[PDB]
Design a protein around this ligand. Structure first.
Ligand code: WMQ
Length: 134
């Protein structure tokens, strides 16, 4: 057992709040927001040694990132930003910071009861997205 055990698995989106406004804050254009906001992604989290992989699959886009905690990587986000990302574990919360064009946004993933809760923040705009096991 180990570092991310309680996050590993296949998760499905069950609710979202304020995601359109979060995406507006990030700078996402109208048509991408509409199609992305309609998506119902499955998130697939796995661990092999020290390497964590997070996949997000939907009709909008399929993404995959692999990383080592605390070790920066370059990521092309689903909305086509080129960002410098670092993911760390802080008190049992996976904290994903993206840096680009002098801006920053943070995506936190938390296990709460039987759910996996995703909190996306930029400036004062937050979105909360709740996933359940698939
Ligand atoms: O609920 C999630 O898993 C979740 C929330 S935010 C995230 C990764 O970032 C993004 C994904 C899709 C679209 C956009 C647009 C801006 N950022 C985006 N994944």
């Amino acid at each position: 057992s180990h570092m991310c055990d309680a996050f590993v698995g296949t998760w499905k989106l069950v609710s979202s709040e304020n995601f359109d406004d979060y995406m507006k804050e990030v700078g996402v254009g109208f048509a991408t927001r509409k199609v992305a906001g309609m998506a119902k992604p499955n998130m697939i989290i796995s661990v092999n040694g020290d390497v964590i992989t997070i996949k997000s699959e939907s009709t909008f886009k399929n993404t995959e990132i692999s990383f080592i905690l605390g070790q920066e990587f370059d990521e092309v986000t689903a909305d086509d930003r080129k960002v410098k990302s670092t993911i760390t574990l802080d008190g049992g919360v996976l904290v994903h910071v993206q840096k680009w064009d002098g801006k920053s946004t943070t995506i936190k993933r938390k296990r709460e009861d039987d759910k996996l809760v995703v909190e996306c923040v930029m400036k004062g705009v937050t979105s909360t997205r709740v996933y359940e096991r698939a």
